[PDB]
Amino acid sequence: QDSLSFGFPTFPSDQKNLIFQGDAQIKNNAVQLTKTDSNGNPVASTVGRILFSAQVHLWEKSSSRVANFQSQFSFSLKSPLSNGADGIAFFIAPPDTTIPSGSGGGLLGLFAPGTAQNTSANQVIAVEFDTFYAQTWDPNYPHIGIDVNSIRSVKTVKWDRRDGQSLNVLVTFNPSTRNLDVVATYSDGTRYEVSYEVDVRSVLPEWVRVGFSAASGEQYQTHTLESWSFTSTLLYT
Amino acid sequence: QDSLSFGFPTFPSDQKNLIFQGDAQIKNNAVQLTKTDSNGNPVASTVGRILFSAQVHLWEKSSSRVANFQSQFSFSLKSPLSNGADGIAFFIAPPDTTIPSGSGGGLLGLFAPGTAQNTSANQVIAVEFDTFYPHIGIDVNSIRSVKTVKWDRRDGQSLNVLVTFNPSTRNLDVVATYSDGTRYEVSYEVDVRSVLPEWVRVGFSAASGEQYQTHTLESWSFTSTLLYT
Ligand SMILES: OC[C@H]1O[C@H](O)[C@@H](O)[C@@H](O)[C@@H]1O
């Protein structure tokens, strides 16, 4: 299809179009990407991801078209301790993507340790929310980063972690300008913006899958996806 | 998801979210449900169907919600014969639906002979365009339409159809038009909750028995959103 869109105002436990990987699962109408105990508390050494089953047509060589898309979502992080790790990320990757071996902790379940910074060995675009808890490639402060085939963000902006508070995020890609814009805000109006120019055609295959990934190494916290809407349409360029 | 939409203004041969069953395949940016030879002419004894990959959340028991959906599509039928058959149908069925053994010809690849008229043995809502007088029929768990209206078969002309379901009135409305303004309408009240499971798949089916014709799906757009009834 040239156009595709779907919306999850909440996440009921009766799911049919979500691909669950690692420890990801539904609890209390939300997606718990990282493992939680019976008390609903976060645990260490856990990784989880989800993908929408339908494949998205990102670009079409044949017609020289590239999709215009936007993903809107909300998440919250919680922990008994004052801070947590490691972070959550929205990502776009090849349809058959699976959790790489040894991609826990700071790798957010997105990259393999041996090729984490090798742009030629990866095909992925991600918007990460790093809670910088525990000191090496990205800035030494919590931030929102845009990753293009590397765990080392090509662009970042300072960010603030607030326990238990939902962050509303809007990610958009405009094929005529090639700008991938990210806007995140807390209910009180605190806003965070970061954008980057990138030609998705040279980074990802024509058909891709979209979803989220999160991980906790030694330090932990829950990475709870609360809502998610996505729309995409191929446009002539 | 509570809401889902997709649109195929055309059907390029590079598809990833379509489930092809029977002889259905893409040819010339269109879906050819029934088999065609090398020259592109229709042949006898052929059945084909396609379903969209992602399951549609039709209704939800917990929240007591039911989906408001719209399916807009266009197709054309061509046949050198004076009596092309058998027809094409838009249908909604359980996720694991497959072509029933012996469902060719008049059964349109939708029902099995033994239970084609046994409502209790089927779970499917379909809107058929039968050409073997020609008519538009609304099927609910049976090949025996709950109602039909007269229709005209125009060889090689595209018919634009809009099928909608309003959970508030439980009305399933069908509107079909030819490019000259010729209009056909038929409506039926039905509670989809009592007919289909909460999650379903949507697609099209077509077949030709001894008499034949091409069944070409040219475009298709679908949208669905759960609402409070
Ligand atoms: O094609 C016309 C006709 O051919 C055969 O007689 C059977 O397959 C029927 O079901 C079908 O209606």
Which residues share a beta bridge with B74?
B160, B219
Protein residue with least CA distance to atom 1, ligand 1: B209
In chain A, what residues touch B221 (CB-CB under 8 Å)?
Answer: 3
- Residue appearing with tokens 């990210």: A182
Q: How many CA atoms lie within 13 A of B161 on its CB side?
A: 28
Distance CA B43, CA B212 (A): 6
What is the β-pairing status of strands A3-8 and A30-32? unpaired
Distance, in Å, from the CA atom of B161 to the CA atom of B174, rounded to the nearest integer, reads 7
Residue A79 has which token pair? 């922990």
Alpha-carbon dihedral B200, B204, B209, B212, rounded to 10 degrees: 180
Helix, strand counts (H, E) of chain B: 0, 17
Q: Which residues contact B131 (CB under 8 A, 6 or more apart)?
A: B77, B83, B84, B85, B86, B87, B153, B213
Can you tell me the distance from the alpha carbon of B66 to that of B62, in angstroms, rounded to the nearest whole number? 11
Helix (H, G, I), strand (E, B) or coil at A190: coil
Residues of B with Cβ-Cβ distance to A60 under 8 angstroms: 12, 14
Q: What's the CA gap between B172 and B163, in Å, rounded?
A: 7
Q: Which domains does chain A have, with CATH numbers?
A: 2-237 (2.60.120.200)
Residue identified by tokens 């029934």 is B34
Pairing of strands B18-22, B3-8: unpaired
**Which of B1, B65, B201, B225 to mutate to probe the A interface, most A CBs <10 Å?**
B1
Residue in the block written with tokens 């902790």: A105
Q: Count of CB atoms within 10 A of residue B190's CB? A: 15
The burial class, CB within 10 Å (0-12 / 13-18 / 19+), for A167 is buried
Answer for the pair B55, B201: CB distance below 8 angstroms, yes or no: yes
In SS3 terms, A138-176 reads as: CCCCCEEEEEECCCCCCEEEECCCCCCCCEEEEEEEECC
CB-closest option in B2, B7, B95 to A8: B2
Could you give the angle at the alpha carbon of A25 between the alpha carbons of A19 and A27, nearest 5°?
Answer: 135
Torsions phi, psi for B34 (to 5 deg): -100, 150
Beta bridge partners of B154: none
How many Å apart are CA A110 and CA A126, to the nearest integer? 9
The alpha carbon of B140 and the centre of ligand 1 are apart by a number of angstroms equal to 21
Residues in chain A: 237
Amino acid at A141: Y
DSSP bridge pairs for B46: B208
